[model samples]
Target: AFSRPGLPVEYLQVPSPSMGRDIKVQFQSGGANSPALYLLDGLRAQDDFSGWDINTPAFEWYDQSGLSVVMPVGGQSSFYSDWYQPACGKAGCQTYKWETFLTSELPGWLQANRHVKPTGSAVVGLSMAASSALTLAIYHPQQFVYAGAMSGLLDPSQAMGPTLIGLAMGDAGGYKASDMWGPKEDPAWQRNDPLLNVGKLIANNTRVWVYCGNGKPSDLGGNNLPAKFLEGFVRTSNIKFQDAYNAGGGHNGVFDFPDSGTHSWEYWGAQLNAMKPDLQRALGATPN
Candidate 1:
C-alpha cells in the first residue's frame, strides 16, 4: 500500500480482454467482503484514476464498514457499456468494452485478490455512471444483488436521449455520441435504456435505489448555479422514471427524492451513505 497525501493508496492495473488498454482499479478490501460495493464514476472519469478518490470519503469510510469498496478508472461517454464500435466520430476512434470487463474479468480479479465471493455484490454510480450501474446489475443479476444511481438518466431510448448524450459527450469528451452505441436509429439505444429494460431488473428480483436533486439547491450545492439548473432537469427526469418503475411493477426499490439539493458530489455522497442499510442487508451484514 502507498499514500495519497498520507497513506493507504493502491491501484492495480487490472487486465481487461475487452479494451484497447488495461483498466485501472482503485481498490481497498478492508473487511472480508460481505458483498463488495462497486462505485462507478461520472462522465468526466479520468484515465489516470477514479474520481471517487477526490470526490468522496468512500475509501476511508468503507475501510471498516465490513464491505469491500472498488472503483474502476476511465470510460468517459462509454457509459460502461459494450459499444457498437470503438466510438468513431468527431473526436476519434476509441475502444470501450466495459460490460464484458466488469462482469467477467473484474469479478474474477476481485475474488482472487480481495478474497470475496464472485456474486452478491452491489453497485452505485453518479450522473453518467448512475444509469450504467443500474444497467450492469440488470444484465448480470447473478453477480449483483442491488443497484443505486444518482442523478442518472433512466430512459435513453426516447427522442431526446441521443440529443442529450450528444450534448454531454460534446462537452465532456470531444468524442461524438455516435461512437457510444451508434446513430440514434441504431438498436443499441433501446437496448441500453434503463427505463425500457427495467423489466429485466425486476424479473431478476434485484433491489434498486435512486436519488436526484430537484431544482431547489440545498446548503451543500446552493452556491453552484449551473449545477442547480441541471439538477432541475435531473429531478424531473428521475421522477418520471420512478413513476414508470412503479407502474412497471418495480419492486424492492427505494428512491430518495428530495426537494432541495443539486447535482453535486455532496448530494451523491449523502445518497451513498443513506443506502448503507440496504446494502448491508443484501450482504447479510448488520447496519452500521
Candidate 2:
C-alpha cells in the first residue's frame, strides 16, 4: 500500500540529529512542484512505517489527485517533539526533535531532492498525531496553509489532558510523559498545548479543520474495541477543542461534529476522503 496502483513511491531517509538517528519518510511524488500534505500517523505509530499506508487507500486515492503525500515513520509517543530529555521505550531511547525534523530538515531535504515546494504545505493527523498536527502547524504556521485533525486530543495540558496523555502513551507502547516534556508543570507541556495555543494558530491565519465522531461505534465493522475505548477521550476532547477554537476568535478553522462513527480505521479513512476538497484547495489542486 506504500505505492498507488501504478504510481511510483520512494522512501527518503533524512538525518535527525535531535534523535541521533536517521528518520525514514515515505514519499509519493505528485504533479511537478505541486503543493504537499504531511500525513501523520496515530498513537501506535511504528518505527518502520506509518500505519496510514497499511490501513488506508491514501496512496491509491492521492495517486490520481496530483497532490504529493509525505508520511514520516516512527515516533510512537514523542508527539513529534524535541523532547526535554531522552526517553527510553520499547523502540529504544533517544531524543525526538520532530518539530525541527519536519519544519527544517525534512523540507530542506525534499526541495534539494524532490520537486516539493518550500512553502504553502499542509498537514493532517489522527488520534495522537492529530494533536501533533496542530502543534506543528502553529509552531511553523508560516509554512503550512492548512492543518486538519481527526479523533485528536486537542486540549492536551488542560482538564484531564495530563492524565489522558499519560495513559494513552503508556497504552501506546509503554512510553512515559516525563520522557516527552517532563512533569505536568513543565513549561514545554503548556507551550505545546493546542487548546491554549490555537488562538495563536488563528492569529497566524492558519486554516484549520477539526473532526470527531459521536459516541456511536457501528462504523468499525464489528471491531469496535478501539472506538469503544476512545469514544470518551476523542469525542470529549473534540468538544472542548471546538469550544476553545471558537472562543479564541478563530477565523479560518472548521469543525465537523458528525453524529455517528467512532475512532477506528474506517472513520479515519472516511475523514480523509471528506477532507480531500479543502486539502486540495489548500494545495491549489483540483479535486476529482
Candidate 3:
C-alpha cells in the first residue's frame, strides 16, 4: 500500500472559487494540528500528477515530519499566478487565478477541512515556480513564513527573461507569457520578479532558501546537456537575487550554490532535505 500505516495520503479536490473549479491536490497528512508546506512544480507540470511526487520521494520522506504536504496539480507554464488573461490550450482557454487560490482559498479550505493551521505555512518551488514562492511570501507574509527556491529563474524581468519565458511556456503547454502577466513592458513582470522584491522580503522577514547548481553535471545525469545549460542560466540569476537580498539587509536567507549538479530531481530533493530543519523551526513543526 502507498499509505504508511498511521499517515494518511489523499488526492483531494480543493475548490477554487476564483478559478471557478476544483483543483486537484495531492495531500500527505503529517498531523491534523501541524503546519503545511506547499510544493510547486515546474513548467511541464502534469495534469494528472505533480512532478514532485512523480520524480522525487518528498511525500514519502516528509510523511512524518510534522507538516502536511500539499501539492496542487496542473499549472503547466502558468507560473502559479493570477493571469491577466486566459491562455488557450487544446482543451480550451481557462482562467488561472492561482495566486488568489493558493494564498486565500486553499488556506481557508485547509483550516476548515484538514484542521491544519492557516498561518505560518511554508512554500517551496522548483524551476519555474521558484520566483512565485517568493512572491507569495512577500505579499502574504502572514500565511507563509518560509519560502525556498531550487534552481529558480528569480529575475524574469531582466534582459531576455520575458522572451525565454515565452519559449519555455510554448514548449510546456503552448502558453504565452503575455497572457500570464501582460506584455514584456508591463509592470506586472517587474512586480513579480524576485530581484525587484528583495526589500519587501527583508521587511517581511520570511525565511528564504535558494539553491542552484553549476553547469557541471553530478551523478544525477551525466550527459544532460540541456539541463546543464539550463541550470547554468538559472544560477546566474540566483546569484544576483542572493546579492540583492544580502545588500538589502535581508539576513534570513539561505543561499546554496553547489559546485556540480544539473536541473533535475536529485538536486531538488537534496535541497528539500537540507531545508528540513529550518522549515521545521520556522513553523514550530513537530512529529505526529
| Every candidate's CA RMSD | 2.3, 2.2, 1.7
Q: How far is candidate 1 from the true structure (C-alpha RMSD, Å)?
A: 2.3
lDDT of 2 by residue, 35-113 (tens): 7889998888887878888788887678757678899998888787887777677667777788888898888878877
Which ten-residue region of model 1 has the weakest summed lDDT? 1-10
Please report, in order, the local distance difference test score of every candidate based on alpha carbons.
0.79, 0.80, 0.88
Residue-pair clashes per prediction, in order, are 0, 0, 0
lDDT of 3 by residue, 1-288 (tens): 133556577788998898999999989876877898999999888989999889888887886889999999998888999998886665678889999999989989888988879899999999999999999898888998899898988999999999999899888878888888889999999999999998998998999999999989877663588888999998999999999999899999898998987888888887887787788888899976
What is residue 267's positional error in candidate 3, in angstroms? 1.1
- Residue 161 alpha-carbon offset, candidate 1, angstroms: 1.4
- Summing lDDT over every window of 10 consecutive residues in candidate 3, give the lowest-scoring window: 1-10
Give the per-residue lDDT of model 1 (tens digit) for 24-86: 888876455557788999988887878787777877766656677788898777788887667
Instruction: Name the TM-score of candidate 2.
Output: 0.93
TM-scores of all models?
A: 0.92, 0.93, 0.96
Clashing pairs in 3: none
Candidate ordering by TM-score (highest first) = 3, 2, 1
